[PDB]
Amino acid sequence: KIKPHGPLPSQTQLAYLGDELAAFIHFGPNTFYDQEWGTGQEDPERFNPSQLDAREWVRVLKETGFKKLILVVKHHDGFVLYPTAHTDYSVKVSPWRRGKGDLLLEVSQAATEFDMDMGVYLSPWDAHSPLYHVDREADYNAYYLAQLKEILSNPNYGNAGKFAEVWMNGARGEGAQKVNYEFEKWFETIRDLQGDCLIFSTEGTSIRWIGNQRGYAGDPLWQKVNPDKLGTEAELNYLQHGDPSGTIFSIGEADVSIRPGWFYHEDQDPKSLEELVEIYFHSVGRGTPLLLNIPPNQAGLFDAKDIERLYEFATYRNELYKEDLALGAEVSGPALSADFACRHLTDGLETSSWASDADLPIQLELDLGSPKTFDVIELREDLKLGQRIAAFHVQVEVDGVWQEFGSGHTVGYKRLLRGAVVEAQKIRVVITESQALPLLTKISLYKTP
């Protein structure tokens, strides 16, 4: 047996890493006020998306490869998009659905139909609530917690009653009240109702912020941190790269809007395909999920251009992965045992993996059997045994000279590394630094479309 190394991921964490793509939905009063942050003074009468079709949101996301939908149900403005018992500042007083509307239910029904996992974003900062004050913070915490209970205990919310992620945004305006949150009590309730449901927060939960809203994970990206170096004043580079000596497994989730803003603005356009592809390689291609925000318009529909762009992005990915040019390639180099043999890297069996306790550097050489043309290499670690690799490089033989293809720090769950398009038959993967004996589950090669 190989012993584990470092902090190990939970099954829910591994599941998210495997899923890769999640969608965010920011929609609410801000959409009608053409703004990014609201004050809590917005008029509920303005909230009337009469053409809203939550099933279309879910259908398009499902068809374009998203595996989770994180819905904003209360942004910083404090307007609640389901009929909570706990405030009057909700859809109950809006004309939408004649006051009888429940956006969390509408989305949940569609998600259940499509087997789309659900997340829920409930803003800690609340610019509306009279309880949002240091002098009333116990009451505000009870309000927040009561809403968690309403959302997470109702079998009609979630994907068949299940939530996969809870989002606790760390943002608060200059000159807001400095309310402190009862995080542990909140986390306890989340477990009680939803088990190992992932939580995004400023604290030492299973998901952290990557430290930017550009969709950019660092290299290295260690999916681990020490919770005592988080909080609202966590260093951006600490979030972006993680901690080589981290004590908990932590996914640095890469959130980014398809538009400049999180909410829909008529005068904005979605990112180009080119732009989304760069994001993809720097998020999913660095071993962390991409959480891409798609904001419905004032009608309650995704914008036509955004929809087109999501199908274009899905096509791109489907084409990228159409053929693994490394499948069945002969692999040589050191290997711990037959059970961890080199051939496990290209055998297309996800139940087989390679490992070596040899001295570094470790050099794996692939022979594709004939010259093939590629510009992407994919490597994967076995994170059930912990993240280990800290430096590697790749070379390709060109006219009898071993030339560089590219280099990196970490591998993680999955690392895509691009290089110049090359026609080659022999490739070397060289592991040069690792915290423990390296394991890899797969080496793949692709040509970008």
Place this chain on the structure above:
Amino acid sequence: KIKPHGPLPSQTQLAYLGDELAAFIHFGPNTFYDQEWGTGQEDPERFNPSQLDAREWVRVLKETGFKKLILVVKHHDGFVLYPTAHTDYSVKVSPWRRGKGDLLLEVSQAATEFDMDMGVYLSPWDAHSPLYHVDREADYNAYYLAQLKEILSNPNYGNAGKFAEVWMNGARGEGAQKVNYEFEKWFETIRDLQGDCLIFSTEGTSIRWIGNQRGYAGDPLWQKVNPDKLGTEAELNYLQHGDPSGTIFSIGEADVSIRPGWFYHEDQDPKSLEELVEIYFHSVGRGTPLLLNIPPNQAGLFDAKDIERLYEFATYRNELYKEDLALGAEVSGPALSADFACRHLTDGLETSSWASDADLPIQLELDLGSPKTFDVIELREDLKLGQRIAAFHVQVEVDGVWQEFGSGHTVGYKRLLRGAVVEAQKIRVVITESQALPLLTKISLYKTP
């Protein structure tokens, strides 16, 4: 009052950093044999450029903003491109210029005319020389040394007899003799003849390899290293990022070819303008020089496409820097003294700088006086006092919300950081990690053409 921090750059190091752009020329038997490496078996009869014109090489490089030209005078194949006294394997037995050719002379004459600084590449690995053998190590070292003297002592070579850089490539083929080099003796002779002349080597000299041939400097890029971690087995990431605790100032030179290969190949084309721009931002824009290789063809001329590409590249840079949108902006934040005032960051005077010993984070806010449109910020440290900054980020105010523009690790001699195109009047530069109290000499803003 301010004490220096860390290893300080030499005058020659600072001059190169200020110059930013160097050209490389790989030309020789390999050009005629359509290969990247040679064996020393190449036939000197075949070395016969129809129309070589070094003045044209120099003219174009000068007009396109290059400040130094590093010329290969002997590649791994061992063929010497000046009439050396120390081997018969040279242009003396070539039909070029009826056996009387001297490529170093032709280049130096033109370089002297155009005041183009000169570098020389003399390959340590020599596949031809009968002295290149462990049994004949001292004889090979004496051969290499004698050639350094031929090159570096002759007033007709260099820019008016001066060389700015000597290049000692670390590459050697796997099969080759394991000759060791008399580095210290070589460096002493280089100092005797050429003073502070920069040296690129695998050892602890003034220039190191960045660790790839893609034109990519890391972030961070510490322009310093510990010589005990260099040699041929230096880790690539160590070269690419430098050493936060480095003991010598070291420029990680970013060398890259305009083509896939270093030598000219008929079937290859130059990089796009877009590709060169990306390289630029990741080399010069991360505080290190770009050394761009332009290989003459079999006629001894630069390819017409390569030339056009060099002009397009120069045009781009000229446009980019045409207007500094931050000039004269009001700058607020902590400052060490009147001598180090905030206003020095945008006063246009290269002799005024800012510093602060305030507790981190240090926040500098610029007010441009009116909304301006930009997508690049430039920061510079004062490396005469040592490299210090280890983390910073930049924010811009958009509709009363402070939004991120971008973040990084190091600044160094010069850091360009691109962000989404924004129209803003107010920007914040926030320094969050620094090895000693931070200094900056300038903040500039540009719009990419």
